[PDB]
Chains A and B, each alone.
Chain A
Amino acid sequence: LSWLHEINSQELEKAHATLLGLANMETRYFAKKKTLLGLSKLAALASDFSEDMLQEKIEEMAEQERFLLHQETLPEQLLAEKQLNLSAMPVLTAPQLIGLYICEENRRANEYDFKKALDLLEYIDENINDLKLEILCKALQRDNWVSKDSIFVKILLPEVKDLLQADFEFVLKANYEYYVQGQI
């Protein structure tokens, strides 16, 4: 816990260093992780790093901040209902967050929520396509075939499935036709 001292000594390149490290090992409390990383970033900013060395560090923290954004933006009601401590739950993984964003219990779920779930595939780190389907199918169900349409306009493609997805088909092909003209 040297960061506490490294700060009082004005060694902020170093306090940023230990702070960033603790931030990475954090898994017990999301909120703790968040803070430590915010703390890490303040140290970096308030230190004497090179104008590029700095923009290089705040570069890669914007990258982690990009991941904690998903758990950060979990609906308060979804949380209220799974009865989870507003801010005492642990740093979830991408598998876990999709479960939630995809959970049928998440009523107010729209394109954004499923969108979030999709981007989350890239944060899996080693079957990804199955999920990609499960999460896609569940977007149409809420639409009672609007939204599966909107999720596609946002992504603006050969990753999605068609024939195998189906495995009421009237509109599926209709979109799988408007998709043709779109992707081409």
Chain B
Amino acid sequence: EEDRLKIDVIDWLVFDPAQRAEALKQGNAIMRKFLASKKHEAAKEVFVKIPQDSIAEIYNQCEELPAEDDNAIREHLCIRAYLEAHETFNEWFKHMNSVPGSWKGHLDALTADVKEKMYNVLLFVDGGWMVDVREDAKEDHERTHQMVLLRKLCLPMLCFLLHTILHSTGQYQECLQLADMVSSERHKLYLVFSKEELRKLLQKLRESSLMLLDQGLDPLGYEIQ
């Protein structure tokens, strides 16, 4: 009710090119809300309303950038990176079950591709996903709160999608190196995991060391000697 109004408005904010940063910001706000409630299509619908050129557009209204606008952009890219991660997983998944030599060939392409989209989000450049790169922005506690929650909401999920993808296709050594990734002090992905999820993660990797031992390799997938 209060939400349907805002998104109906995105259509008007996208009208005037001179107010393109505002579209971007207000578009981000909604999707931050959607994604907070796991509503991936809800968010994807708002997304497609952004003119897919709106960023080159903003850069042209400057060429002289405001923190808030610099962030709206990074955040918009984040939210994109995140939707692509899920759509490619859907695609990959479909294919892992179609089961009709061009097939496997396309399968490795998908596996290799979703792997990348996942890592894109997990190790999002220069700060990480839903993390502002600009501190001089005007105080906004609601946004800051929301962004901190999305890292807790969406980040661990992708970690598990990622393990699956890797295990599902025998990349078991890489599965165990998720341990490297999550505990890395570079990103501290670990401090957005609940103890419940860290356990879940640990137990999934066990399944992966069993599969490695099953091949005459050590639990981490290395040779014995």
Contacts and interface: CB of A to CB of B under 8 A. Distances in A.
B206 interface: yes
Interface residues of B, number: 24
Interface string A119-138: 00000000000000000000
A contacts with B: majority SS: helix
B206 A42 contact: no
Contacts of B183: 37-39, 41-42, 45
Nearest to A41: B183
A32 B201 CA distance: 18
Interface stretch (A1-9, A101-109, A140-148, A158-166): A1-9
Contacts of B218: 32
Interface string A1-26: 10010011010100000000000000
A160 B48 CA distance: 60
A36 B220 contact: yes
B10 to A, nearest CB: 40
A36 B199 CA distance: 16
Interface in B176-216: 176-177, 179-185, 190, 193, 195, 198-199, 201-203, 205-206, 209
Contacts, number: 60
B135 to A, nearest CB: 23
B198 A46 contact: yes
A116 interface: no
Interface in B31-50: none
B185 to A, nearest CB: 6
B203 A65 contact: no
Interface in B132-189: 176-177, 179-185
B180 A65 contact: no
Nearest to A1: B219
Given A1-B219, A4-B209, A42-B190, A35 B202 contact: no
B222 A32 contact: yes
A38 B202 contact: no
Nearest to B205: A39
B198 A35 contact: no
A62 B185 contact: yes
Contacts of B219: 1, 4
B contacts with A: majority SS: helix
A46 B195 contact: yes
A interface bracket (residues with beta carbon within 8 Å of B): 20 to 34
B220 to A, nearest CB: 5
Nearest to A5: B206
Given A42-B201, A46-B199, A35 B190 contact: no
B207 to A, nearest CB: 10
A70 interface: no
Given A41-B190, A42-B183, A7 B198 contact: no
A34 B184 CA distance: 10
A39 B222 contact: no
Contacts of A1: 219
A43 interface: yes
- Between A37, A39, A43, the greatest number of chain B beta carbons within 10 A of the residue's beta carbon is seen for A39
Contacts of B190: 41-42, 45
- Between A29, A36, A42, the greatest number of chain B beta carbons within 10 A of the residue's beta carbon is seen for A42
Contacts of B180: 34-35, 38
Interface of B: 176-177, 179-185, 190, 193, 195, 198-199, 201-203, 205-206, 209, 218-220, 222
Given A31-B177, A42-B202, 4 more contacts: A32-B218, A35-B180, A39-B179, A39-B183
8 contacts: A8-B203, A31-B177, A32-B220, A35-B220, A38-B181, A39-B205, A46-B201, A65-B185
